[PDB]
Design an enzyme around this catalytic site. Structure first.
Site, PDB file in Angstrom:
ATOM      1  N   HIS A  45       0.799  -1.228   0.000  1.00  0.00           N
ATOM      2  CA  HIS A  45       0.000   0.000   0.000  1.00  0.00           C
ATOM      3  C   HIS A  45       0.840   1.290   0.000  1.00  0.00           C
ATOM      4  CE1 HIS A  45       0.125   1.039   4.310  1.00  0.00           C
ATOM      5  NE2 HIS A  45      -0.135  -0.233   4.614  1.00  0.00           N
TER       6      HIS A  45
ATOM      7  N   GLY B 131       2.297   5.964  10.086  1.00  0.00           N
ATOM      8  CA  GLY B 131       3.725   5.967   9.763  1.00  0.00           C
ATOM      9  C   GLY B 131       4.456   4.714  10.230  1.00  0.00           C
TER      10      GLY B 131
ATOM     11  N   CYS C   7       3.586   1.628   9.481  1.00  0.00           N
ATOM     12  CA  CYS C   7       3.475   0.524   8.519  1.00  0.00           C
ATOM     13  C   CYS C   7       4.818   0.058   8.027  1.00  0.00           C
ATOM     14  CB  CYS C   7       2.546   0.884   7.375  1.00  0.00           C
ATOM     15  SG  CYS C   7       0.849   1.189   7.901  1.00  0.00           S
TER      16      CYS C   7
HETATM   17  O1  LIG Z   1      -4.458   1.597   8.796  1.00  0.00           O
HETATM   18  C1  LIG Z   1      -3.781   2.375   8.144  1.00  0.00           C
HETATM   19  C2  LIG Z   1      -4.148   2.708   6.702  1.00  0.00           C
HETATM   20  C3  LIG Z   1      -4.777   1.522   5.987  1.00  0.00           C
HETATM   21  C4  LIG Z   1      -6.138   1.500   5.706  1.00  0.00           C
HETATM   22  C5  LIG Z   1      -6.726   0.381   5.137  1.00  0.00           C
HETATM   23  C6  LIG Z   1      -5.959  -0.736   4.835  1.00  0.00           C
HETATM   24  C7  LIG Z   1      -4.599  -0.691   5.080  1.00  0.00           C
HETATM   25 CL1  LIG Z   1      -3.615  -2.074   4.683  1.00  0.00          CL
HETATM   26  C8  LIG Z   1      -3.998   0.421   5.640  1.00  0.00           C
HETATM   27  C9  LIG Z   1      -2.983   3.273   5.882  1.00  0.00           C
HETATM   28  C10 LIG Z   1      -2.247   4.354   6.663  1.00  0.00           C
HETATM   29  C11 LIG Z   1      -1.679   3.775   7.944  1.00  0.00           C
HETATM   30  N1  LIG Z   1      -2.711   3.035   8.696  1.00  0.00           N
HETATM   31  C12 LIG Z   1      -2.381   2.834  10.075  1.00  0.00           C
HETATM   32  C13 LIG Z   1      -1.623   1.729  10.456  1.00  0.00           C
HETATM   33  N2  LIG Z   1      -1.257   1.444  11.715  1.00  0.00           N
HETATM   34  C14 LIG Z   1      -1.646   2.282  12.670  1.00  0.00           C
HETATM   35  C15 LIG Z   1      -2.417   3.450  12.438  1.00  0.00           C
HETATM   36  C16 LIG Z   1      -2.806   4.339  13.470  1.00  0.00           C
HETATM   37  C17 LIG Z   1      -3.528   5.464  13.183  1.00  0.00           C
HETATM   38  C18 LIG Z   1      -3.905   5.750  11.876  1.00  0.00           C
HETATM   39  C19 LIG Z   1      -3.563   4.910  10.853  1.00  0.00           C
HETATM   40  C20 LIG Z   1      -2.801   3.735  11.096  1.00  0.00           C
END
Ligand SMILES: O=C1[C@H](c2cccc(Cl)c2)CCCN1c1cncc2ccccc12
Ligand SMILES: O=C1[C@H](c2cccc(Cl)c2)CCCN1c1cncc2ccccc12
Ligand SMILES: [Cl-]
Ligand SMILES: [Cl-]
Ligand SMILES: [Cl-]
Lengths: 300, 305
Positions: free
Chosen positions: A41, A143, A145
């Site tokens: 992603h 951030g 990820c």
């Molecule tokens: O969940 C996501 C987003 C996302 C959405 C849908 C599917 C996928 Cl694979 C990823 C992408 C940006 C990063 N993110 C995050 C990943 N970990 C902790 C997070 C804490 C607060 C805010 C976002 C967080």
């Protein structure tokens, strides 16, 4: 003496953390030999997340669209490929700090250390378990990820998790290092939710054996139970069923303490019924399920 | 989201761990530049530990009596001296992996990461706090002596603890890297015990702010308290006094959540007097005191090293 939630020393993994940028998206990558692994992603915008066609988004990228930074050094991307939900970026430099490593896919109940990173820089290390619902209760901000989970049994780092997303309940979902998600999750901003979580029964039993090894016996009782009766009770408290495999795995701890596995199951049944009555077990007022039988033997 | 007991990344410290052997005793050493630091009780036998005269035991040792192993390489000891309860072994090789470092003495309530080692090899990393009674609730077995505690401030490792002993209650005692014990402990096999401990109030408040940041608000209430009324209640429940310094330190967390420090103190007073009523805070049925205000800010903002 003492029993702590202990993570593996993170040095071997810190020397692999890099920053990966694709356009406006920046996250972490794991640099092993001449390949940088990161969530696919990284090629998506927030808009692309609803129904991304990764094959279509990736075909439009060239090697120079990926900027990989290792410390204050920019690595050159000389190839790119996708394997499931991970992007593999071939770089022109093999990581001189690459430890002895393997990629392992873990089962729910397994524990691992997480080295939480931001912009390719390690921020902290903590201990996690793969929950029965395939999520992890991590500590991850935007951030994070590409941060990884690992175990280091005997100088070899076994990478088992790469962070991809946070679910609505604040829990986390990710993949193994081959890019296959743990759980029914997808790297898409679609309605996804963690299933009802349960307690890792075999781990609670392991932790009760750790408490006995460390001198605490207040919760023991004169009772035993059948495996089936235990499961009938335990499932009423949202505890995972205990299988004959779990009973076998607890054998060494049972032999060391002299408390049969089904005798410890009877203490667990009684603890679920009575609570702790103001007492603690290894400094905890709750039953702990993020220590495996293997972690207990390793620490005690 | 999520809030975990998190340690600093240990890599910079792992590259300093060595094995030190003197006779039949093997323990860990910290190799920084051309000096290996380790507990001075490495020169003692079990009988010596009963009543050791370290100056007398040390004068009988030569450099070759100390075997220092860094991985699979034997370092040669070219000098030795004692500083308080720490033995300093001068070696002929400066550690090429020596990070930017300082030796710092911490106060009770301050937290640090412990890299537990056996035979000069790191086994695990965990976070803990210096208790008000100067002990640490660590996890150490025989062979863990010389394991160190540290914090990282930017790119600088601040070594604050070196493991020396386990007290009868299973808690641990050690020194700073200048060999000064934390607490009224001595490196001798004699009757020693941890004093009555107290809860680190400022840390519980920091953890309550972490719970609010993570969406746990059930314990918030309309009430406030004076610092003096809160301190009377704290004394009653074996909680450390909250000073105006603690209130100031919690300022950033108070501004972020919108809950004044004395407003959070009224939540804590209610929790102490009534319990949690079957509820948990950040997955805990006990009030957690091993996260400082700085730890809460760092974890909730993603500070890196
Ligand atoms: O969940 C996501 C987003 C996302 C959405 C849908 C599917 C996928 Cl694979 C990823 C992408 C940006 C990063 N993110 C995050 C990943 N970990 C902790 C997070 C804490 C607060 C805010 C976002 C967080
Ligand atoms: O406490 C001691 C001994 C000791 C006795 C008196 C003074 C001093 Cl400074 C040290 C020396 C041997 C190592 N040791 C230990 C240190 N940590 C964890 C231990 C777990 C189990 C057994 C011993 C442990
Ligand atoms: Cl597994
Ligand atoms: Cl003396
Ligand atoms: Cl309470």
């Amino acid at each position: 003496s003492g029993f702590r939630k202990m993570a593996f020393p993170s040095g071997k993994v810190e020397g692999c953390m890099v920053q990966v940028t694709c356009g406006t998206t920046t996250l972490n990558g794991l640099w092993l030999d001449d390949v940088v692994y990161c969530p696919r992603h990284v090629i998506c915008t927030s808009e692309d997340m609803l129904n991304p066609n990764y094959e279509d988004l990736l075909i439009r990228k060239s090697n120079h669209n990926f900027l990989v930074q290792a410390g204050n050094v920019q690595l050159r991307v000389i190839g790119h490929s996708m394997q499931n939900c991970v992007l593999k970026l071939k770089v022109d430099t093999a990581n001189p700090k690459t430890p002895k490593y393997k990629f392992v896919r873990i089962q729910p109940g397994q524990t691992f250390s997480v080295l939480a990173c931001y912009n390719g820089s390690p921020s902290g290390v903590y201990q996690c378990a793969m929950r029965p619902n395939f999520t992890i209760k991590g500590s991850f901000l935007n951030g994070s990820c590409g941060s990884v989970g690992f175990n280091i049994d005997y100088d070899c780092v076994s990478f088992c998790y790469m962070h991809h997303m946070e679910l609505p309940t604040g829990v986390h979902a990710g993949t193994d290092l081959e890019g296959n998600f743990y759980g029914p999750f997808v790297d898409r901003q679609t309605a996804q939710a963690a299933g009802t979580d349960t307690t890792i029964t075999v781990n609670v039993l392991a932790w009760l054996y750790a408490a006995v090894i460390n001198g605490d016996r207040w919760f023991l009782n004169r009772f035993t139970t059948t495996l089936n009766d235990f499961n009938l009770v335990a499932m009423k408290y949202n505890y995972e069923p205990l299988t004959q495999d779990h009973v076998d795995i607890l054998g060494p701890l049972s032999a060391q303490t002299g408390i049969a596995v089904l005798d410890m199951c009877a203490s667990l049944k009684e603890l679920l019924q009575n609570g702790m009555n103001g007492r603690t077990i290894l400094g905890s007022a709750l039953l702990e399920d993020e220590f495996t039988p293997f972690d207990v033997v390793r620490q005690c």
